[PDB]
Amino acid sequence: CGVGFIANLRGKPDHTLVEQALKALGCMEHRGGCSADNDSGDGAGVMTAIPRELLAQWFNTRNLPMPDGDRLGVGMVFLPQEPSAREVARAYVEEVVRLEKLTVLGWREVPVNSDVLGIQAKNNQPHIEQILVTCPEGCAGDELDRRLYIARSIIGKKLAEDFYVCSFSCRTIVYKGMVRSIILGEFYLDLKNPGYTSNFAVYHRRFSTNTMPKWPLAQPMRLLGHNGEINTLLGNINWMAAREKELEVSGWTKAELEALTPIVNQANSDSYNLDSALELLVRTGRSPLEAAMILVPEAYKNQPALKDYPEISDFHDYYSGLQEPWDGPALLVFSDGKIVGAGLDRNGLRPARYCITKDDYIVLGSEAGVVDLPEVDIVEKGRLAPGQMIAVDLAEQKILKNYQIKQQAAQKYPYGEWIKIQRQTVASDSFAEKTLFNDAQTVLQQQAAFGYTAEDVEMVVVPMASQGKEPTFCMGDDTPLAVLSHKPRLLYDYFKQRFAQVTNPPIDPLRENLVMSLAMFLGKRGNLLEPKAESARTIKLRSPLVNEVELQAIKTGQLQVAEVSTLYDLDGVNSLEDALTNLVKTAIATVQAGAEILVLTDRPNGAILTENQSFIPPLLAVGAVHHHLIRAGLRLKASLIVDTAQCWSTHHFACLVGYGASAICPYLALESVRQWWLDEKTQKLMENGRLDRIDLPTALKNYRQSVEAGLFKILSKMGISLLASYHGAQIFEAIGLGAELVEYAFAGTTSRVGGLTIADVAGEVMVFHGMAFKKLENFGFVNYRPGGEYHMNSPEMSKSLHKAVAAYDHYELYRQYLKDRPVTALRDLLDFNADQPAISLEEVESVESIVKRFCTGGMSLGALSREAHETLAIAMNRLGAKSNSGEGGEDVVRYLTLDDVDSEGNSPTLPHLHGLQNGDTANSAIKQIASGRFGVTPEYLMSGKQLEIKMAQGAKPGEGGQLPGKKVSEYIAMLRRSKPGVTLISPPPHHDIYSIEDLAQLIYDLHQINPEAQVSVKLVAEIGIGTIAAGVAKANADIIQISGHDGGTGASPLSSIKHAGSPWELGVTEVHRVLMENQLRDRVLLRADGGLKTGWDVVMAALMGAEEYGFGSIAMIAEGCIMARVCHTNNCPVGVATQQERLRQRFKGVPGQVVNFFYFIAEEVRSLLAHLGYRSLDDIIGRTDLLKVRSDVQLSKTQNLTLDCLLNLPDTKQNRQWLNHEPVHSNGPVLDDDILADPDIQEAINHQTTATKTYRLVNTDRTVGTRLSGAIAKKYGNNGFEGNITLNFQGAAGQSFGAFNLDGMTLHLQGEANDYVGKGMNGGEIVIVPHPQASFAPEDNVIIGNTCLYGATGGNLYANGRAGERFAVRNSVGKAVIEGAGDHCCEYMTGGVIVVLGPVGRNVGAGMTGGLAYFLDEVGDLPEKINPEIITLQRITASKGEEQLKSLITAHVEHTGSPKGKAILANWSDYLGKFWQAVPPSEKDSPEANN
Ligand SMILES: Cc1cc2nc3c(=O)[nH]c(=O)nc-3n(C[C@H](O)[C@H](O)[C@H](O)COP(=O)(O)O)c2cc1C
Ligand SMILES: O=C(O)CCC(=O)C(=O)O
Ligand code: F3S
């Protein structure tokens, strides 16, 4: 979406501002989407003041007196088209208006031109009228809008696509519709009426994830226009709804508040709910600014900018206890008709740029280019940094800046005094060291009974306590889903973590930890509407993990505490179900008796579980009491603490909090740590072979630190900062839980496959009871064991495949390893139901044809040896299929076809490979673009047939790629332009992609540089992918990859491998269905991966809607992988997943073997087609009617699954045209096409001549220069061009100006630019300066946006002005001089040189591992703004450093004329001492940092 506002402070209200708003909307068209007719819009709208001059004509025609402005209520209403229905609706509106004691003056038919609408919107269009209203008692202004708000809320009980009030106010009105931006004013005649005047406008252009427009869903809403995505919505809704029955404020009756009723509803969009909640806050006595501060609070902790504003910190300190953030990316633009303003989310994940004139005229929007004001009278160009706001007081004619706004709200009450007196904090650095139990026999028995398994303590708890981090592992989750397993599992294992992809970004829990918090508040939640001292009475925790000391301190504390047992007797009468019934009833009664904290314990009275008792699993207990308290209207009366033996992993703590726990005492987990440390084997080891750097207090501290780190990780996967927001929210998908159970304890969680009843979960806990009543059982779970859990991959299976394939049987032995499998994946429950007789094999399409659909897929050159990586590429190219350069870039030597193969199959070009032939090429057909951008060079991008944007992989979907430092050889460091020994943890998000429109921008950038390459987007299966994928299709992607939770990895957290991501069957099927239903299916080819091994797997994936098939782990096995599962270790025995030269030499593996593998699978596909009676894969894709449930399958834990999710797909027997795709989608006409068509430019490219051209630019001119870069790179590579092209531009540049710039290209821009300037720049020069007529001091003003130089591998940028956040984010070799920046300057920088001649925001140098930066700090507060994890700050001492800085500023002055640079150079000696130099420990001994 695009959004913004314009305000005329000092001039008379006019039509010009309205025209400007419509033009601004037009400049934001690329930020919105269109319906299936490619004509109707997802939404465009404007909010303005009431057009009094226009409405006067209506009063005149009627000979009616017109009331004063603050006395005339106007309702803009969408009504039914059908006349009889329209009159029932009208009568209802009038009826409620009368009930508010208001008078209906009449109705105005709104003049429209329906013939400009797209066909779907035209079909959809409501009948649009305005109701005119007054108060005969004389109410006006605030009170009138209050009564209209009440009226709106009552009328809104009958919401329909057909019956909706857009606005009802005496100050504001909204004109909106399902239109493209330039259509809005052609549809509403009022908007082009010169009599329409307004002192402000809020405009919005919508991007939706569907193709079926509904008019009420355009924006603005009543108060707010919203760009972003709420990532905690289910939680935010649940908490707010729980407030509804108890609402109380001065100035309001109980009955009026009751009329507002459902403030929030999960049926409605995030935007609708936010508008509603925010208006409730406004209309009960806050400004919209204060409302937004409470609902979407700043990350106020560790904010140096708040040093002189203690009251602002106090405000948030207070509200932190009352209201969790409605988190996720957001630019909010809103108006009262009194104030108009804007604010960002805590992380500033949407852009907001603004402009102020000499007359205090102000323009703010998603992009800077957007209103043409005389450049000469602009007095400031600014932006909103994270959490910031800006506003206008219309009556006062005043612009209000960030901290002025917040201080005024904060000073209303003595928030801090209240906290001082009322709040209790519980925290303890010490643990209890005395053991709970004395017999290790007791400890072991309790462990067994509560579900601890040998690997649980050995592979999970012990590493957490001994290392202080959760464990890393490798390869995929090879095992049956918990519901399909014959092994006992925990209720936790049925819940998969949800995560962010495309529609909102993950955040970085390490680099941007400063923005996150695990703090929690215990006790009753106060009145949100009426601030009082009482509401600060709480117990604050710094962490949800409460140790024995902290638990006792809580039990004492100032709040009423009650213990509630989760145990019950096994008396042959009690069941888990009535124990649950009793639990819930007890909890309610206990809360009714005044308990403010409930401790749900499986150790009541401090007594141990016996053989005569069982327990309610803590996740079941907490979920049940959480939801039943909600149902009882008691949820805000108390907090829940889980005191449980069944909690030890990172995933456990997250599930517990996600479903209602404020805090957890994991008493058996702590006891497990104690007993491990106090084990003579451990004590004896420490005397030599384990780190005895660990006394008991350190082991315990390490354990807790591991859990806390793991919680930050899980939150960040979804982009969530505060545990308080995660607490209500239910950021999971359940797999294998029945509807009845889900409704009882996990209401609102999707669980698409049915499954477990309450009785089934009890049966499962009883398996562990029977094991408990010498050592814990080791099940198969992490690594294959002879009698353990089944793994799809194992060494023996692997060895028979490799020998079958090297032979030219071994394959039949391999084939039966697979068929003897227990049920493992969802597809295992299905079988074929043919609708046609079998045909003969000779009729079926050839193996050569089928193999074209196969992809090997992106395994990085760091994770794999070049031997294993290149071998795959040669094999896929021989096949006419595709391989993928995962996220480590690619060696340029591979771009060329092999010429020099001898008769033994060896090539001097790639001498480490074997079994080659002269036609061969190791070029990866698919080139990957991942968040780290390591590969990412113009030549690299031109070498791809296809380009893949990797949003997530199945093994670790919330997170970035991971390459252990030991595997970063000099070779890898060269490819990646990073530092040899250094661990690469890639950013979780693309800093390029914080929304669907930002993804559309990256796809545009890729189509720009390489218009012939298809662009794919790699997603991971989870509920919500369908919606996401519809967006991706609207964003002009050519392909969508769906990856299963299943897939391999060279290194990932073990928790992520086991707990995050869903089956591909669910993903492929959901995406296929959603695309077909939106009529978007023809727009994209669908590819699938995750545990694909076999022709049968391929046929199953085909039936579910996949057209292409990816293979990772299995392809590695074909090359000799023996499933050692030490990939993350660098010790691969077989030279596949290692960089060690001497292990690489062991690599046997020839392209011919993997060729043979794929022919085997394709032959299997042919036998299956013949059986089904079809000639071709093309005939069966999406034919889910050929699937049936297998009758020979009986599940261990439950009766059956529900598989409608897989079977109920749209009919595809007859309608198959969606299989026909356009070769590659176009960007449409682009300025670079005109540049490239110019004969002088063609001459400069082809003859390497000098050329210069000059052009006017506007914000809709995106990615300029980039198509020319691609053309040069295609011909000359990155460094071959000897020509010289200078392009001069004037105006406001759109997104991605100078992306992928190369040597020989000079881009000059006079004006300003939007985000991503020089994205992936490789060479040349970009120079950005203000207009000559600009009067402001350039160094004090924004000229460039966010994420500039992202992943740059070379080049120089000179900008005479300030940048936004993440300047030089992941810079590898770019150089730049700028005059100031927002937050996170140089964030993942590994090289190059950055000079900032002005103030910078906080979090400087987070993850900066190489390169140098120089910061001019004339204030003296820079040391407070550094991220101290890696870089050191020092004054310039080395003469080489001084000369490097001086040369760059001298260049900056020559290019720019920078007045600031000139002043520095004129007084060099005075300014030198005010610079700080940022030095990572790779640069400590460089001459420019040392000596
Ligand atoms: C060794 C290894 C390294 C991988 N590295 C990447 C990476 O560079 N980028 C990426 O998108 N996926 C990466 N993945 C995931 C694969 O692209 C693919 O999605 C996965 O292997 C498919 O599942 P499968 O192994 O069961 O066939 C890697 C997988 C493994 C096996
Ligand atoms: O090589 C990289 O940087 C990422 C690869 C990765 O995370 C994986 O092996 O799954
Ligand atoms: S599992 Fe990994 S360590 Fe080697 S043998 Fe296979 S690549």
Cα–Cα distance measured from residue 1100 to residue 499, given in angstroms and rounded to the nearest whole number: 26
Residue with tokens 């991220």: 1427
495-497/732-734 β-pairing? antiparallel
Contact 1365, 1347 (CB under 8 A): yes
Burial class, 36, CB count within 10 angstroms (exposed 0-12 / middle 13-18 / buried 19+): middle
- The encoded tokens of residue 38 equal 């490619």
Residue 578 CB partners (closer than 8 Å, separation 6+):
none
Size of the chain in residues = 1491
User: Quick check: CB of 1091 below 6 Å from ligand 1?
Assistant: yes
Cα–Cα distance measured from residue 1162 to residue 1178, given in angstroms and rounded to the nearest whole number: 14
- H or E element in which residue 168 lies: strand 164-169
Distances (CA, A) of 24 to 181, 367, 573, 1305: 9, 9, 71, 31
Give the DSSP letter of residue 460.
Answer: I
Pocket of ligand 3 (CB under 6 A): 475, 1116, 1121-1127, 1132-1134, 1136-1137
Give the DSSP letter of residue 456.
Answer: I
Cα–Cα distance measured from residue 105 to residue 136, given in angstroms and rounded to the nearest whole number: 11
Residue 1315 CB partners (closer than 8 Å, separation 6+):
351, 1295, 1296, 1345, 1346, 1347, 1348, 1364
How many CA atoms lie within 13 Å of 34's alpha carbon, on the beta-carbon side?
Answer: 17
Cα–Cα distance measured from residue 1110 to residue 268, given in angstroms and rounded to the nearest whole number: 37
Angle, helices 650-658 vs 618-632, to 10°: value is: 10
CA of 913 to the centre of ligand 3 (A): 19
Cα–Cα distance measured from residue 286 to residue 531, given in angstroms and rounded to the nearest whole number: 11
Report the C-alpha dihedral over residues 1325, 1331, 1334, 1339, rounded to 10 degrees: -10
C-alpha 940: how far from its chain's center? 27
Among candidates 586, 543, 541, which has minimal Cα distance to 563?
A: 586
Cα–Cα distance measured from residue 1066 to residue 1042, given in angstroms and rounded to the nearest whole number: 10
Contact 885, 956 (CB under 8 A): no
CA of 4 to the centre of ligand 2 (A): 40
Preceding peptide of 220 cis, ω within 30°: yes
Residue 423 phi/psi, 5-degree rounding, is: -85, 135
Cα–Cα distance measured from residue 480 to residue 492, given in angstroms and rounded to the nearest whole number: 15
C-alpha 694: how far from its chain's center? 38
Count CB-CB contacts under 10 A for residue 838: 12
Residue 863 CB partners (closer than 8 Å, separation 6+):
886, 888, 963, 967, 1049, 1050, 1051, 1127, 1137
Q: Which are the catalytic amino acids?
A: 1
Cα–Cα distance measured from residue 1376 to residue 507, given in angstroms and rounded to the nearest whole number: 26
Ligand (nearest to CA of 1021)? 1
Burial class, 1192, CB count within 10 angstroms (exposed 0-12 / middle 13-18 / buried 19+): exposed
Cα–Cα distance measured from residue 1073 to residue 1065, given in angstroms and rounded to the nearest whole number: 12
Q: Is 496 helix (H, G, I), strand (E, B) or coil?
A: strand
Nearest CA to ligand 1 atom 21: 1112
Please measure the distance between the N-terminal and C-terminal CA atoms of the chain and give it in whole angstroms. Answer: 52
User: Quick check: CB of 984 below 6 Å from ligand 2?
Assistant: yes
Residue with tokens 């035209």: 122
CA of 857 to the centre of ligand 1 (A): 7
Q: Which of 887, 979, 982 to mutate to test the pocket of ligand 2 (most atoms within 8 A of CB)?
A: 887
Ligand 2 atom at minimum distance from 934 CA:
3
Nearest CA to ligand 2 atom 9: 1050
Contact 478, 791 (CB under 8 A): yes
Report the C-alpha dihedral over residues 983, 988, 993, 999, rounded to 10 degrees: 100
- The encoded tokens of residue 113 equal 């031109």
User: Quick check: CB of 1092 below 6 Å from ligand 1?
Assistant: yes
Among candidates 502, 496, 469, 467, which has minimal Cα distance to 482?
A: 496
Residue 536 CB partners (closer than 8 Å, separation 6+):
318, 321, 415, 418, 419, 421, 422, 423, 526
Among candidates 169, 259, 275, which has minimal Cα distance to 220?
A: 275
- H or E element in which residue 189 lies: helix 189-192
Contact 848, 880 (CB under 8 A): yes
Ligand 2 atom at minimum distance from 1127 CA:
9
| Planar angle of CA 472, 478, 483, nearest 5 degrees | 110
Cα–Cα distance measured from residue 489 to residue 1246, given in angstroms and rounded to the nearest whole number: 66
Ligand (nearest to CA of 967)? 2
Ligand 1 atom at minimum distance from 1091 CA:
26
Residue 205 pairs in a beta bridge with 2, 44
CA of 1247 to the centre of ligand 1 (A): 43
Q: Map out the domains of the chain with their CATH numbers.
A: 1-421+525-533 (3.60.20.10), 422-470+482-524+534-782 (3.20.20.70), 471-481+783-1228 (3.20.20.70), 1229-1491 (2.160.20.60)
Count CB-CB contacts under 10 A for residue 7: 26
Among candidates 1080, 1304, 1297, which has minimal Cα distance to 34?
A: 1080
Contact 354, 1 (CB under 8 A): no
Residue 1301 pairs in a beta bridge with none
Residue 1475 CB partners (closer than 8 Å, separation 6+):
1414, 1415, 1416, 1417, 1435, 1436, 1445
Ligand (nearest to CA of 1057)? 2
How many CA atoms lie within 13 Å of 1075's alpha carbon, on the beta-carbon side?
Answer: 28
User: Quick check: CB of 954 below 6 Å from ligand 2?
Assistant: no
Cα–Cα distance measured from residue 1028 to residue 208, given in angstroms and rounded to the nearest whole number: 10
Contact 373, 355 (CB under 8 A): yes
Provide the b/e sequence for 695-719 (b: ≥16 CB within 10 Å): eeebbbbbbbbbbbbbbbbbbbbbb
Residue 615 pairs in a beta bridge with 567
Contact 1187, 832 (CB under 8 A): yes
Cα–Cα distance measured from residue 208 to residue 273, given in angstroms and rounded to the nearest whole number: 16
Among candidates 1283, 935, 1295, which has minimal Cα distance to 1268?
A: 1283
Residue 821 CB partners (closer than 8 Å, separation 6+):
790, 792, 828
C-alpha 915: how far from its chain's center? 44
Contact 635, 242 (CB under 8 A): yes
Give the DSSP letter of residue 1385.
Answer: T
SS3 content of the chain, % helix, strand, coil (to 5): 40, 20, 45
Nearest CA to ligand 3 atom 4: 1132
Residue with tokens 């113009």: 938
User: Quick check: CB of 860 below 6 Å from ligand 2?
Assistant: yes
User: Quick check: CB of 1137 below 6 Å from ligand 1?
Assistant: yes
Q: Is 516 helix (H, G, I), strand (E, B) or coil?
A: coil
Cα–Cα distance measured from residue 1225 to residue 1384, given in angstroms and rounded to the nearest whole number: 35
Contact 1087, 1067 (CB under 8 A): no
Contact 830, 1190 (CB under 8 A): yes
User: Quick check: CB of 1063 below 6 Å from ligand 1?
Assistant: no
Cα–Cα distance measured from residue 988 to residue 511, given in angstroms and rounded to the nearest whole number: 10
SS3 labels along 93-151: HHHHHHHCCCEEEEEEECCECHHHCCHHHHHHCCEEEEEEEECCCCCCHHHHHHHHHHH
CA of 978 to the centre of ligand 1 (A): 22
Residue 1192 CB partners (closer than 8 Å, separation 6+):
none
Ligand 1 atom at minimum distance from 948 CA:
11
DSSP 1165-1210: HHHHHHHHT-S-HHHHTT-GGGEEE-SS---SSSS----HHHH---
Residue 782 phi/psi, 5-degree rounding, is: -85, -45
CA of 723 to the centre of ligand 2 (A): 28
Residue 129 pairs in a beta bridge with 77, 109
Distances (CA, A) of 449 to 602, 608, 619, 932, 1209: 12, 11, 16, 45, 43
Q: Which of 859, 1130, 1132 to mutate to test the pocket of ligand 1 (most atoms within 8 A of CB)?
A: 859
- The encoded tokens of residue 269 equal 């969009």
Residue 885 pairs in a beta bridge with 927
Cα–Cα distance measured from residue 1275 to residue 1268, given in angstroms and rounded to the nearest whole number: 11
Cα–Cα distance measured from residue 129 to residue 1477, given in angstroms and rounded to the nearest whole number: 64
- Residue 960's identity, in one-letter code, is G
Resolution in A: 2.0
Residue 109 pairs in a beta bridge with 129
User: Quick check: CB of 1089 below 6 Å from ligand 1?
Assistant: yes
Cα–Cα distance measured from residue 1338 to residue 1311, given in angstroms and rounded to the nearest whole number: 11
Q: Which of 953, 1016, 1119 to mutate to test the pocket of ligand 1 (most atoms within 8 A of CB)?
A: 953
Cα–Cα distance measured from residue 299 to residue 302, given in angstroms and rounded to the nearest whole number: 8
Residue 741 phi/psi, 5-degree rounding, is: -60, -45
Count CB-CB contacts under 10 A for residue 751: 23
Among candidates 836, 1074, 1028, 1060, which has minimal Cα distance to 955?
A: 1060
- The encoded tokens of residue 178 equal 């399902």
The answer to the question of whether 1127 is labelled as a binding residue is: yes
SS3 labels along 718-761: CCCCEHHHHHCCCCEEECCECHHHHHHHCCCCCCCCCCECHHHH
CA of 460 to the centre of ligand 1 (A): 24
Residue 947 phi/psi, 5-degree rounding, is: -125, 130
Q: Is 227 helix (H, G, I), strand (E, B) or coil?
A: strand
The answer to the question of whether 1121 is labelled as a binding residue is: yes
